[PDB]
């Protein structure tokens, strides 16, 4: 009960900050409240389907697929911060499947494209995803919430790769 409250206050504190300054770096001190929360993993990620993203990409050795996952998350985090930047890049409205970086990093993982739809790339074509032509601009609140969980999850996988997670034997599940 009171654990959920502390979790959601820190959540909005970092998301708001990331909405002020899209390029704002966050330290492990600022993120420790979300990583160290007693809440289960399924309850600490509200937009991103973290349970699936980890399990559905455990192929080969952990040293391999955990780096493959961390990379996809790092790129996805950039997709999110780009939509929040005061000067959004041109072509921000659509991501085409044959883009080299997306193909070899994000598309290479199950659930990568689902994260783009969370950002607002909901309209699907045979060549990629794109925003609805009707929507003028990103939902700044939704983008910031998704980016934080991508940033957060990548951080959990980094701690495990360093073998220093608050509850490492937990996510071993």
């Amino acid at each position: 009960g009171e654990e959920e409250r502390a979790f959601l206050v820190a959540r909005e504190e970092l998301a708001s900050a990331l909405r002020r300054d899209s390029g704002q770096a966050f330290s492990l001190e600022q993120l420790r409240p979300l990583l160290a929360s007693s809440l289960p993993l399924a309850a600490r990620y509200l937009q991103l389907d973290a349970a699936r993203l980890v399990r559905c990409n455990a192929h080969g050795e952990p040293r391999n697929y955990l780096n493959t996952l961390s990379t996809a998350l790092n790129i996805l985090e950039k997709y999110g911060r780009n939509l929040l930047s005061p000067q959004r890049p041109r072509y921000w409205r659509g991501v085409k499947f044959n883009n080299p970086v997306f193909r070899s990093t994000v598309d290479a993982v199950q659930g990568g494209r689902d994260v783009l739809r969370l950002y607002g790339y909901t309209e699907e074509q045979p060549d990629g995803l794109s925003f609805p032509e009707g929507q003028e601009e990103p939902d700044e609140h939704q983008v910031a919430t998704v980016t934080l969980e991508v940033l957060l999850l990548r951080t959990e996988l980094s701690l495990l790769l360093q073998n220093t997670h608050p509850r490492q034997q937990a996510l071993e599940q």
Partner: peptide
């Protein structure tokens, strides 16, 4: 910066 969008 790195292009994450265009098919070309």
């Amino acid at each position: 910066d790195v292009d994450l969008y265009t098919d070309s």
